[PDB]
Amino acid sequence: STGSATTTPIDSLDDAYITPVQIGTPAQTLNLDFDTGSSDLWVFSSETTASEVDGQTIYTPSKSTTAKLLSGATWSISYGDGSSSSGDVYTDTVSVGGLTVTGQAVESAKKVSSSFTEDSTIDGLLGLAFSTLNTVSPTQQKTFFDNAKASLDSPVFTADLGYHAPGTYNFGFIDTTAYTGSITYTAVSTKQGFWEWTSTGYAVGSGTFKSTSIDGIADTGTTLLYLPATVVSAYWAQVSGAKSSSSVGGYVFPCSATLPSFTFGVGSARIVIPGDYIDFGPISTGSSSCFGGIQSSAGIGINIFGDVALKAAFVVFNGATTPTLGFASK
Numbered sequence: 109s110t111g112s113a114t115t116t117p118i119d120s121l122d123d124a125y126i127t128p129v130q131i132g133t134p135a136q137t138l139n140l141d142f143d144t145g146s147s148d149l150w151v152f153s154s155e156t157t158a159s160e161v162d163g164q165t166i167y168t169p170s171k172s173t174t175a176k177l178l179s180g181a182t183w184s185i186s187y188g189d190g191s192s193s194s195g196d197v198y199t200d201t202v203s204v205g206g207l208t209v210t211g212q213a214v215e216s217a218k219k220v221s222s223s224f225t226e227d228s229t230i231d232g233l234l235g236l237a238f239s240t241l242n243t244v245s246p247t248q249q250k251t252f253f254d255n256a257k258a259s260l261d262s263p264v265f266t267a268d269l270g271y272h273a274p275g276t277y278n279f280g281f282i283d284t285t286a287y288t289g290s291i292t293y294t295a296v297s298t299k300q301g302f303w304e305w306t307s308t309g310y311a312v313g314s315g316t317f318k319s320t321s322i323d324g325i326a327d328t329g330t331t332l333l334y335l336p337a338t339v340v341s342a343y344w345a346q347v348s349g350a351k352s353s354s355s356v357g358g359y360v361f362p363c364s365a366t367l368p369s370f371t372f373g374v375g376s377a378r379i380v381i382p383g384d385y386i387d388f389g390p391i392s393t394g395s396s397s398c399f400g401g402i403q404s405s406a407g408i409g410i411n412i413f414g415d416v417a418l419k420a421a422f423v424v425f426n427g428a429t430t431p432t433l434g435f436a437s438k
């Protein structure tokens with residue numbers, strides 16, 4: 109089997125991407141944030157505290173003839189940015205782009221933090237990291253990909269995120285029309301539960317490539333590119349007026365600037381992020397200071413190849429017996 113679904117930016121800055129997902133019988137379609145950095149499929153629901161729902165579409169398990177309470181199971185998750193959610197668990201039929209899993213754990217939110225309530229466009233998350241990170245207790249649950257894998261034509265999914273435009277998540281096949289050149293595959297460590305790999309270096313604009321190993325994770329659920337402070341300083345030093353602002357929480361730059369590109373290495377291959385992908389617009393409405401899309405990972409504890417990086421590439425998440433990651437230009 110295969111599946112193919114379009115993923116769409118939630119706003120004009122590509123702050124996150126939503127993909128329609130069918131849950132239950134008859135189908136209830138919710139727009140979920142596919143997150144290769146976490147491993148829980150959770151949704152706003154008829155159980156979510158009413159004051160914490162503000163425009164989201166909710167899953168109502170009592171209206172699904174295939175929903176079953178997973179008795180005694182609870183979940184609770186906190187993401188790197190301070191947001192969080194928690195609740196109980198159902199199993200139900202879940203379909204993405206024509207690919208169906210029966211008995212998928214659908215984690216129903218009883219509580220969500222304020223930034224989830226504030227994102228009316230995001231009805232929940234669909235985790236695509238390794239199932240060892242799933243938070244369901246006392247019986248840990250598998251991701252949608254993990255459950256689908258044996259039925260797929262090939263044990264893979266691909267992320268093809270757009271810049272200011274829709275893109276695609278495919279399951280079970282590699283669309284050879286969606287990228288240019290060849291796909292370069294690179295080793296993955298699953299020891300922390302992430303799609304963790306080592307980039308071979310970077311360049312800023314037209315500058316010479318610096319060969320240096322940068323461990324990090326491929327994370328579709330993180331907006332920005334978070335890299336070591338040395339790398340980030342070298343980037344922003346090429347932008348007149350750019351500075352790290354403690355009050356804003358990162359590097360800012362004059363909105364009048366045209367930004368240089370940023371290249372990262374994948375083996376001997378190179379992925380080029382155009383400068384415009386690094387512009388996250390005014391720090392507050394009407395400001396002429398703009399927020400940078402490359403930020404320091406110092407204090408995160410891990411480097412994160414988030415949407416800013418991934419949307420410059422066609423990315424293969426290869427879930428073969430030994431997982432690997434593939435990157436192609438597009």
Ligand SMILES: c1cc(CNc2ccc3c(c2)OCCO3)ccn1
Pocket residue numbers: 121123331332356357388389390391392398399
């Ligand atoms: C990246 C972007 C966002 C939301 N967008 C956004 C845009 C500009 C900003 C911002 C946030 O926060 C800092 C000030 O400037 C949230 C998380 N990562």
Ligand SMILES: Cc1cc(C(=O)Nc2ccncc2)c(C)o1
Pocket residue numbers: 143145146187188189191223224227329330
């Ligand atoms: C500003 C913001 C970020 C998030 C958010 O969900 N973070 C996030 C970060 C990493 N992985 C998954 C999710 C929210 C609700 O608001």
Ligand SMILES: CNCc1ccc(Oc2cccnc2)o1
Pocket residue numbers: 119123124223224226227329330331
């Ligand atoms: C959470 N409300 C503020 C807001 C609007 C857009 C964004 O940015 C997001 C949202 C979700 C995930 N990652 C980044 O934050």
